[PDB]
Design a binder for this molecule. Structure first.
Ligand SMILES: O=[N+]([O-])c1c(Nc2cc(F)cc(Cl)c2)ccc2nonc12
Lengths: 110, 107
């Protein structure tokens, strides 16, 4: 059984700047409901600071993956456990600011 | 002349290198619709002369968890090849996340 997941791209602040349409099956929102919003706006109050801090550190880890588990508010207002694996990218031919690529998978807290 | 965002596209692969996702930026660059790549191995698209090098890069990706591919040619939908480089990352193994950036026009 394939895990339900979707890819997103974020600026260093956390704002969704690209969202794969597999988000609808994973968390119930259309891409347009996520784009322009901070991922933290969908995060359980208890996990928000962890998520902020994860985004702040991933840019320091030389492109390695940083993982975080957090509760994501689905379109039905229910808390889903997500495991987000994130890493930075910047096109090496440029000095554009790094952005963050995330794979977001609904997982069990068991 | 194209800006950076336009020359980059994201893909996802199963551990056998079959596409499981591709972003639509590939269409303007290489010709493919993402839907037609799904379930096809990346290996179907490498130039013959890059095939042994990409096998090695895939081995390095699987052993280390990440790789920069080096330059290679991807077969374009309507003939010819585009030069690309790819940064691959294994998501833990669950899948491979690729950031792909085009280095040439179709040749
Ligand atoms: O999926 N991989 O694991 C992988 C690559 N993926 C890939 C992505 C594309 F958009 C097009 C092609 Cl032909 C291959 C490309 C070069 C790689 N070198 O090592 N792994 C690679």
């Amino acid at each position: 059984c394939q895990p339900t997941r979707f890819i997103s791209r974020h600026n260093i602040e956390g704002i969704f700047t690209f969202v794969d349409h597999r988000c609808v099956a994973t968390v119930g929102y259309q891409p347009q409901e996520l784009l322009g919003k901070n991922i933290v706006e969908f995060c359980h109050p208890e996990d928000q600071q962890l998520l902020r801090d994860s985004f702040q550190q991933v840019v320091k880890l030389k492109g390695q993956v940083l993982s975080v588990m957090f509760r994501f508010r689905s379109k039905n207002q229910e808390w889903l456990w997500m495991r987000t694996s994130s890493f930075t990218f910047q096109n090496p031919y440029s000095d554009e600011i790094e952005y963050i690529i995330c794979t977001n998978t609904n997982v069990k807290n068991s | 002349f194209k800006g950076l965002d336009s020359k980059t596209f994201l893909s996802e692969h199963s551990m056998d290198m079959k596409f499981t996702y591709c972003d639509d930026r590939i269409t303007e660059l290489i010709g493919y619709h993402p839907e037609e790549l799904l379930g096809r191995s990346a290996y179907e698209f490498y130039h013959a002369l890059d095939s042994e090098n990409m096998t090695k890069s895939h081995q390095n990706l699987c052993t280390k968890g990440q790789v920069v591919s080096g330059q290679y040619r991807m077969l374009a939908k309507h003939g010819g090849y585009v030069w690309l480089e790819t940064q691959g990352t294994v998501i833990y193994p669950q899948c491979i996340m690729c950031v792909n950036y085009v280095l040439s026009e179709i040749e």
